[PDB]
Each structure stands twice: as structure tokens, then as C-alpha cells.
């Protein structure tokens, strides 16, 4: 079931067992369950172009070419049913290596207890 | 079909590595399967961000307890 798959994904990403990722699973379920406004772009080519522009903006032309090649390979493989959604997700999760990661203050650890 | 899925997953992993996304092969396959089932990409991005924050908190806790 997709829910079990999401739980397993959370466990894999966190490196904890599914029982240890219950709060993260709940957070994910809450986020997915929230009503979202329609996505700006539901067109695979528009999402791909936005991802390419974002990759070029970070001066990662090699990474932009690699992304374009991976998108071409995914499109030819035909395994994904919603190419536009996956491309939009990948664009949304890209991070600029030049923008120094806003190091999550050690202070966040204070409230975890 | 299996070879096509493997090629797509390898391409996705290479793209994630070049873009420094931090996704592994299993996580990328799970995301691809979820996307094929119709999940909204904005909701998926928000969920991914929350999961990444939780994973970072868990990694910080594991590094503090070790």
C-alpha cells in the first residue's frame, strides 16, 4: 500500500525503524492531507524548463545537462505516469550549492527532548 | 520494461547526485512510484521538506547520543 511505502521511505531517509518515524510519518500524512491550491504548472515540459533554468541559475551547467538527460531517460522509459508532477517535485527539491546552507541552529535539538 | 525502469532510476540517481538532492536509489524509486500514482507535486514538496527536517533532527539526535 502507498501508505506503507511512504512509511518505509521515511524510515529509510531518517535511518530509523517505522515505529521510530511515527511523528515524521504523521507530519507527512498531515502535509499530504492539507488542501493545496492547484500547482502552477501541470505540463511536463514547463516543469522541465523551470528545473533547467533553476539549475543554470546556480551555475551548474553540467548538473543542468545531467538533469535534462535524466529527464529524457525517464520519459523514454515510460515508467512514470505523471511526468509533470515528478519533474515539479525534483525542481522544488533542488538546492543551490553556492547558497551557504542556513545551518539549523543546535537550538532545534533543545526542544527535541 | 524492467531495463527501462532500471535506466530511469539510474538517470534519476545521477541527476540527484549532480544536483546534490541527497536522495538515494530507494527513496528516488519510492518518489517515482508515488508520482506515477498521481500525488500533487506541491503537496509532495511540502511533505518532502517536512520529512527532511525530521530526518535532520533525527540525525542530529543520533550524532548527539553517539
Amino acid at each position: 500500500s502507498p501508505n506503507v511505502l511512504l512509511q518505509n521511505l521515511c524510515c529509510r531517509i531518517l535511518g530509523r525503524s517505522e515505529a521510530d518515524v511515527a511523528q515524521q510519518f504523521q507530519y507527512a500524512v498531515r502535509v499530504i492531507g492539507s488542501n493545496f491550491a492547484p500547482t502552477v504548472e501541470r505540463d511536463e515540459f514547463l516543469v522541465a524548463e523551470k528545473i533547467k533554468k533553476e539549475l543554470i541559475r546556480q551555475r551548474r551547467e553540467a548538473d543542468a545537462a545531467l538533469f535534462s538527460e535524466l529527464h529524457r531517460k525517464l520519459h523514454s522509459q515510460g515508467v512514470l505516469k505523471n511526468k509533470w508532477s515528478i519533474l515539479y517535485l525534483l525542481l522544488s527539491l533542488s538546492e543551490d550549492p553556492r547558497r551557504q546552507p542556513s545551518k539549523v541552529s543546535s537550538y532545534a535539538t533543545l526542544f527535541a527532548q | 520494461n524492467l531495463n527501462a525502469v532500471r535506466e530511469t532510476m539510474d538517470v534519476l540517481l545521477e541527476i540527484s547526485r549532480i544536483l546534490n538532492t541527497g536522495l538515494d536509489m530507494e527513496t528516488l524509486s519510492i518518489c517515482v512510484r508515488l508520482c506515477e500514482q498521481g500525488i500533487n507535486p506541491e503537496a509532495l514538496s511540502s511533505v518532502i521538506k517536512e520529512l527532511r527536517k525530521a530526518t535532520e533532527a533525527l540525525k542530529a539526535a543520533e550524532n548527539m547520543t553517539s
Binding site: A37, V40, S92 | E42, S45
Partner: peptide
């Protein structure tokens, strides 16, 4: 008073639309 060419008007419109879309997207993401 050299009238803005149709191409220049389209370019300016696309630039403004892109900036407004980026602002809307940033607000939506936030």
C-alpha cells in the same frame, strides 16, 4: 517617441509575468 515594438512589448510582458509568477510561487511556497 519611438513606439515600443510589438516584440519589445511582448518581451516586457513576459518578464513582468515571470517576476509576478515567481513572487506568487514564493508566497505560495512560504
Amino acid at each position: 517617441n519611438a513606439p515600443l515594438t510589438s516584440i519589445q512589448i511582448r518581451f516586457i510582458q513576459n518578464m513582468i509575468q515571470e517576476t509576478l509568477d515567481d513572487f506568487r510561487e514564493a508566497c505560495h511556497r512560504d
